[PDB]
Amino acid sequence: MVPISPIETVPVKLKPGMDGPKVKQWPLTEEKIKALVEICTEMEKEGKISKIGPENPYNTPVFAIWRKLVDFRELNKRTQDFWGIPHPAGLKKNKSVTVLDVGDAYFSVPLDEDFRKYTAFTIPSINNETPGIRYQYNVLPQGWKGSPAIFQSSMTKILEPFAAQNPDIVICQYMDDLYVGSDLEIGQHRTKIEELRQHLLRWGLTTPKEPPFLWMGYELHPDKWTVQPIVLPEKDSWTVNDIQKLVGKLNWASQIYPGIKVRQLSKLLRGTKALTEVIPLTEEAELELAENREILKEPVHGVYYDPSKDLIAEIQKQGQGQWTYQIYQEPFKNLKTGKYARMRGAHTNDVKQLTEAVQKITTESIVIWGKTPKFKLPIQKETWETWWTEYWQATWIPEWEFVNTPPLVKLWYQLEKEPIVGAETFYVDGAANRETKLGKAGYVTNKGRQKVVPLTNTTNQKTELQAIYLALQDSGLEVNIVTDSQYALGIIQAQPDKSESELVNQIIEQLIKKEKVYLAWVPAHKGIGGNEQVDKLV
Amino acid sequence: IETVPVKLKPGMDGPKVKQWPLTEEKIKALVEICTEMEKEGKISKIGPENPYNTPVFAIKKKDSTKWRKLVDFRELNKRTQDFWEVQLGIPHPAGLKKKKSVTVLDVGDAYFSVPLDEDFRKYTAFTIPSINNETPGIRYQYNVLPQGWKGSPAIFQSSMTKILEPFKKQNPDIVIYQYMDDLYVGSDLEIGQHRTKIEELRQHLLRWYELHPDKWTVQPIVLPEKDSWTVNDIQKLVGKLNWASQIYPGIKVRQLSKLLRGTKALTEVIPLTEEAELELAENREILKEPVHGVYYDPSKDLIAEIQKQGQGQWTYQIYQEPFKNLKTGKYARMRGAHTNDVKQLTEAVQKITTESIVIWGKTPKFKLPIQKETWETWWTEYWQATWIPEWEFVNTPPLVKLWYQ
Ligand SMILES: N#C/C=C/c1cc(Cl)cc(Oc2ccc(Cl)cc2OCCn2ccc(=O)[nH]c2=O)c1
């Protein structure tokens, strides 16, 4: 007998102040009991478990489905705390790739001898006329809180020396599996796989799939990868759960499939806490999902990663706060794809969203490939220059170049830094009564032009915005506007090109049509002439 | 040579903090570094029985192409028991900020000579991540005093006293302060003699950054001096004075606003009256005085606000309570940052933090004019400092930007 290398156990404790679990054993049928007795007999014969006495107060309930099923949930609660799937697009192309799934994974790894007493379970005797048979685990139980961590740590420990000795190959480990790969000849490769299996066998780990591999929702082929086929449930009644499922599947498909739009369907899920309800859909949503079924018609594949080639990312504006991206080292062949939706906000502009998308893609790319990709962006260099130079927040994009693929991201308007000479000067104000919701908004100018419009169902902020808007409507291509509103100025200084508010959008539309606009702020109630709160106070 | 027992606060569990993604080069750097440290017993690999984790990354200091290992100890530092020793919270050297010049050194190398308490080691656990989760991360724990920990200077403090003992008695012109892994040395000497003295101190430590605190100040509020004023000029002036009235008691704008009466074009020149000139004068005089009743409270938190002025210009204010400023300043510094806002911001945050360490002996809590995602993505690339401060994000543009310009 060639001596087996001992697997050193991991010391395990319970949570502080807690004791081991004690739970009464459930009554079982005679057949179940016989099956359990047989299974536990052969298991004890294999050394996986040991018979114990009355000296162990702890008990873990058991069922038979044969197959023994032990429920550790209470022990899991009283057990201590223990310490993202690999993406196919990150995998490097290899002439040979072997998959090894170790059998009896958890049962091949011993359990800390002091913790074994807490794993104790009992098989009920027939007709409850005899004391139940007592057992405890000498190895990692299936369904125990600490099994996977201990198992993978042990596996890594065992794998370390072989990997150091074999630089010409690469070994990835996910949970219960090893995925090995090399660019060597198939004979040498298979030989080294045999050697690895021998090395694992040395520690008492038993090991035996060929391409295409079906793994974690993906499909892996030697030269390419894709996602397992997506099935979109078809029903005349769409529930909340069905929309969560559908959104999940569409998000999942969006990594390989370009152009997936989840916005409408996700918008339908706002503030819904429920399961079964029938929710209708707008023509936007229907056309969206139909176009999704259109994109899912002819399947597409992603390729693998080549470190010798530049990593490139390209972004397109999809409209309505939606953005889409592709990552590739070569034309027409994508490593992967994706999408970005704008954050929830009252106001916004294209440049900010583009920036956020760039950050997202950057982080994701650092996760997957360990580097930042070069960007191709639908924005001119001058536009970005103007934007970042004149923006109050600090902002940055990594190395990038302009690609012209309309719609292009642009700056729709720019406020002057100094008062305009020759331009009419509009002093604006608005005010509202809190209880009656009655208000007035208007302006007076230096040329004698004046307006006051009465308004119902409004507030102060809305009357200030309305005042500014009135000034924009009634003025020429170049205008100076004086406001006391910190709210309005705070909105405009954020430079939105779009808003939830219709009033703000009207203001934006007005600014777009203007050659020059200078917006100036003054304190309210300071007796600054031309600034009239008295016209709107009535 | 003997570990001093260290515990945590009353009911605080050790840090569990997610490791953020790292670039391939930084990962390799950390692998080489941690291998060398593993050979030297500084750190040791650990198993799954350790739930705790603290973030880690790699930086590059000034004038060096060699990677340094930076651990983010903020969570551990706040969860670490408040450290009081026989030193009893050694009083901050208030003479350090009054000194002509101050030089900063990295003494962290010493910390690795002192063993760490065995029970506390489990709290220093960190993870070296792998690209694309292909292999499980490499986890270590510190056997010795880790750099970046607040307990390290506190523990090594006695040794540091015994080591610096000869140097301090030799010249009693020199203020010596210690914060984290950095050692600050004040002097009234001349830069050449200062550097020779620095070399002397360094080789004095061997046997066992240039700043100028006197060249800063507390910035006064300034008002324009013009021969002719437009309506816009006066409107801005009134806005600024009205703002400053939250700061100083007797600022009065009525005679200046009196000029603005009637509705006039913004570019029209308005001659100043006698009352208005007198009012502007009295306002200047008021602004020349310091701020009434401004004190530093060691128990409270320091708040630092930063505004982007454009063209490499940044302004900042360090305060405790609103409109009482402990310090204010401007940062124009240009080194290789001209095309990058975030790098500028990062350097500014570092400089402000350093100033705050010199003056109050503690880092402030920043409010940054940047979106969270941008900062969180790019800040580690530009960070040259062994410590890290706290920060938050202001997403609403301040109206008060120009008033500090
Ligand atoms: N189930 C399962 C496997 C899942 C699985 C999971 C992961 Cl994280 C990796 C994996 O295979 C690889 C393992 C090791 C290397 Cl260096 C590259 C690989 O390239 C993968 C690319 N590839 C894929 C298949 C093939 O034949 N050739 C090839 O180059 C397989």
A 201-260 residues with CB < 8 A to B: none
Q: Is the alpha carbon torsion for A316, A319, A320, A324 positive or negative?
A: negative
Buried b (16+ CB within 10 A) or exposed e, B343-356: bbbbbbbbbbbbbb
What SS3 class is residue A282?
A: coil
Extended strands (E) in A307-437: 312-319, 322-328, 336-341, 347-348, 374-377, 400-402, 424-432
List chain B domain ranges. Answer: 5-94+120-160, 95-119+161-210, 211-296, 297-405
Distance from CA of B340 to the nearest CA of A (A): 6
Tell me the residue length of chain B: 405
DSSP state of A421: S
Q: How far is CA A109 from CA A8, A155, A204, B209, in A?
A: 9, 9, 9, 54
Considering CB atoms only, which of B53, B239, B342 is closest to A394?
B342
Are A110 and A139 spatial neighbours (Cβ–Cβ below 8 Å)? yes
How close is the Cα of A358 to the center of ligand 1, in Å? 29
CATH 3.30.565.10 fits A413-538, yes or no: no
CATH architecture of A212-305: 2-Layer Sandwich (3.30)
Q: Is the CB of A212 under 6 A from ligand 1?
A: no
- CATH number attached to the domain at A84-106+148-211: 3.30.70.270
DSSP B333-391: --SS-TT-HHHHHHHHHHHHHHHHHHHHSS--EEEESS-HHHHHHHHHHH---SS--EE
Spatial separation of the C-alpha atoms in residues B228 and B270, rounded to whole Å: 7
Find where tokens 């001209």 sit: B338
CATH number assigned to the domain covering A306-412: 3.30.70.270
- The strand ranges marked E within A96-132 are 96-101, 121-123
Instruction: List B residues 67-106 in contact with A (Cβ-Cβ < 8 A).
Output: none
Judge if A1-83+107-147 and A306-412 fold alike in CATH terms.
no
Instruction: Check residue B299 and report its DSSP letter.
Output: T
Ligand 1 and A340: CB distance under 6 A: no
B297-405 maps to which CATH number?
3.30.70.270
Are A410 and A383 in contact by the 8 Å Cβ rule? The answer is yes
Please report, as a single letter, which amino acid is at residue B210: E
Q: Which residues contact A345 (CB under 8 A, 6 or more apart)?
A: none
A100 lines ligand 1 (CB under 6 A): no
- Each domain of chain A, given as residue ranges in start order, spans 1-83+107-147, 84-106+148-211, 212-305, 306-412, 413-538
CA-wise closest residue to B244 among B87, B402, B92, B390: B402
**For residues B269 and B228, is the Cβ–Cβ distance under 8 A?**
yes
Q: Which chain A residues have a beta carbon less than 8 Å from that of B401? A: 392
Classify domain A1-83+107-147 at the CATH topology level. HIV Type 1 Reverse Transcriptase; Chain A, domain 1 (3.10.10)
Gap between the Cα atoms of B139 and A283, Å rounded: 53
Which runs of E-coded beta strand occur in A378-437?
A: 400-402, 424-432
Longest dimension (CA), chain A: 109
Q: Is residue B49 less than 8 Å (CB to CB) from chain A?
A: yes
Ligand 1 centroid to B48 CA: how many Å? Answer: 26
- B contacts of A388 (beta carbons < 8 Å): 341
Task: Kindly report the nearest CA distance between residue B189 and chain A, in angstroms.
Answer: 39
The tokens for A3 are: 């001596």
User: How many distinct helices (H) and strands (E) make up chain A?
Assistant: 12, 23
Pick from B365, B363, B369, B364: which is nearest to B393 by CA?
Answer: B369
Ligand 1, residue A182: give the atom nearest the CA: 16
Amino acid present at B358: V
Question: CATH assignment of B211-296, given 3.30.70.270, 2.40.50.140, 3.40.1010.20, 3.40.50.740?
Answer: 3.30.70.270
β-pairing, A312-319 vs A322-328, is antiparallel
Nearest to A471 by CA among A506, A442, A446: A442
The answer to whether the Cβ–Cβ distance between A85 and B139 falls below 8 Å is no
Q: Where are the alpha helices (DSSP H) in B19-150?
A: 24-39, 74-79
Q: Tell me the C-alpha distance between B315 and B403, whole Å.
A: 10
Q: Whose CA is nearest to atom 4 of ligand 1?
A: A215
Residues 6+ away with beta carbon under 8 Å from B341: A388, A394, A395, A396, B308, B370
A150 contact residues in B (CB cutoff 8 A) = 47-48
CATH topology of domain B95-119+161-210: Alpha-Beta Plaits (3.30.70)
Cβ–ligand 1 contact at A222 (below 6 Å): yes
Nearest CA-CA distance, residue A395 and chain B, Å: 6
Determination technique used: X-ray
Which of A91, A352, A530 is closest, CB to CB, to B264? A530
Q: How many Å apart are CA A471 and CA A467, to the nearest integer? A: 6
CATH code for B5-94+120-160?
3.10.10.10
Asked whether this chain's domains B5-94+120-160 and B297-405 adopt the same fold, the reply is no
Q: Identify the sign of the CA torsion B260, B264, B266, B267.
A: negative
| Ligand 1 mean position, distance from CA A96 (Å) | 9
Q: Is the CB of A220 under 6 A from ligand 1?
A: yes
Task: Give Cα B332 to chain centroid, integer Å.
Answer: 17
